[PDB]
């Protein structure tokens, strides 16, 4: 049977509202006057007042912006009945899919991260890991996919790129030699987490690395 | 328990601006449209706002007078009126959406109003003033310059000193407190409200209301005695 | 049966093109992969290249602007087949209604109209008629419905509003005494024709009324 | 018959190329422009009746497309020329009419200019050689999925405009012999010749649409 396709609506729409999504029709309307209605959560149960249908025209309406992180999907049913109240179709299932927008910034799991490493180690040696989460969708979009980088290092002794960070794992590593506890006991690294896999918004935290004996 | 509180009177001079407040409680403020309405010696829809996103719809008529805001932190809606004249002196109501049955919501929850002293579907209501005796049938009529869905045609009752009170919705459903004597009917462009047997209680100003795209409009009113 | 509602598209669209109109779906797609196509004038016969459907998704597309005054309606059919080409549905009739925009201005049939009337006549007396045409739709909209008015009269002797004009017929009538040939032999009336039954665009012409014995 | 007729500058100047159309109503058909240097690129297109355009972001600042309705002529202005702009420029009209998104099989013969976020199509191998009777197959891969309705192949021999060969994955264009066959789906497609022939030696280009812009492969040269 031909059915009404799932309707995809990006969260945070600007309208105007009410917004026409799609128009229901029963082909028994050439003969008899038909009246349409909808049921399901959002329409005649909570959340309240999200959807409606125009009774005579069959236009399905969205009355308010949606939020994918609250509710990602709705299941409604369209009904078609004649004036005297007889059903003239089996109810039609109507799916609404709320698609993601990048409305969340990445957030580090803590404000300051600490770690350590021995003065001797070879380049490539793992030191510590930092983490940022992003509430957006990370499967179909990049809106929730975080890329990590080192904005800067202090002090720059013996030189400036003592460390690197893996852009997906957040693992910080040593990439140069000549760490000496007595000389420089502590580096301060400003680390950044950028959503849209590097193309989006950026959040900053600190990672302190202590050098050991 | 849905409540909208408005201060009640404000005195202002011509040309100044004023901000009216509508304090909400009993529900999550961000999720529900708030509408504003003007009344003078009939009723007019100014516009509405969805608080969570700060989205508005305006009646073209008040585009330049009215700007609607919200303060989420204090569950408060505001309407700023600019460059006041005597024409602006009126009662201003806030009203929250709506009825939840799968059709386009209306707004049955009104604040008690604040008193300021200084292209659409037109709804013609007749007669403007009528009188009857108890036991008698009473019927009244509303006609629209353009077609209206039976889902979007409503009636209100107002007695002096009180905010309007939803009476019939979607042509023929009786609102909560409303007695079986009342009945509505109509279709397309002609609608009516009917009382089988008049009663002392029932004396008041009745207003028809439609939506068919914005703006909401009202009839000029029918005053019953 | 539930069907695709007629698709209403305003003429002179700006796109972007191709523009998604509506999405066909067969519920036999949960079990097997389904492929969609469209036929009919505009799709696989002239006019050329106006519509298309996305084979795998079922999205119906409009590829160019439409002109209601050329073609007001299209009748297409949507088809759903499995991989081996076998039909899995009765074809679905798809209507496209091109809705009118007000892309024509009203035009008087001539730039100067002339008429004549006797000095004696009573108010209410018909004098002449003027006419303007408008090529837009005058049935479903007012875009082609003209309203007439008298912008002004010259001279204003004995006073202004000697005449009136019926706002639909264009019939000009006398609405006061007293005309006198010897006194004012000729009035010049600037007449206007406004589409959208008075709400739209305006064209101006002249109507000269000679007063006779 | 649908025909597009196309008839030397220094760096920094502008030049206007013309594409004269006949055999059909000019105002109601999209015209596309295409660049070629020693591969093929889609510049943009225009719908003459309304003067609506789509541009490839890459030529947004070089190219401006106009039309002169009165003379059934499309124009493309190229601004501030460099050596990089020296190329062959083709116009091409839409398209094939079967209910799927049209393409463009009608090319002008091209005009030669000498100067003193998309679905990338990787074609391999770039150059190959074969002997007659042998099977020949070649391959095109796309960074992102493409409908089988919007995957096409062209043949070009030196000195002549490209020539539609296969359309919508597997349909043979008009002049094309049964030896040829196309197949593929999603992100991988191929063109196949059961038995090679002398005739068939040429540069073959895959083409896709999946939203704008149209893209081409780098080409496969057969010898
Ligand atoms: Ca309920
Ligand atoms: Ca959200
Ligand atoms: Ca989101
Ligand atoms: Ca994000
Ligand atoms: Ca037109
Ligand atoms: Ca028109
Ligand atoms: Ca017009
Ligand atoms: Ca004429």
Author numbering:
A (entry chain A), C (entry chain C): 1 to 213
B (entry chain B): 1 to 41, 44 to 120, 141 to 247
D (entry chain D): 1 to 7, 11 to 41, 44 to 121, 141 to 247
Q: Would you copy out the relevant sentences from the publication that reported this structure?
A:
Importantly, the formation of the strand-swap dimer is preceded by an intermediate (transient) homodimer termed the X-dimer.
In the crystal structure, two molecules of antibody are bound to the homodimer species, which is consistent with the stoichiometry observed in the ITC experiment. However, TSP11 slightly altered the conformation of the interface of the dimer by rotating the two EC1 domains by 8.6° with respect to each other.
